[PDB]
Structure 1
């Protein structure tokens, strides 16, 4: 079973692909995998995708 990581974005980031999800400056995202350069995340909209949101801090 994969472990989920709870983090909060500090700056707005735009998805680099159509399968990824856009985030905001103060938007909380649900990470699924941070081992890869690209991180998989989930949103309150029930959508999930891989976004290398380097502009996010763990909390």
Structure 2
């Protein structure tokens, strides 16, 4: 259920949940949800789709 996308720039993972990629690398993306990293009041962080959440 995927499409091959291409990295535009090197990205250096800042946290274990992130992915190191190099410029021009072929990657597989899903269906292509867009995610925000957030933290709740019990101080747990994680990703949620950004269309579930409002400023």
TM-score (norm: length of structure 1): 0.45
**Which structure has the larger Rg over C-alpha atoms?**
2
1 or 2 for the larger relative contact order (CA 8 Å, sep ≥6)?
1
Higher helix share: 2
Higher strand share: 2
TM-score (norm: length of structure 2): 0.48
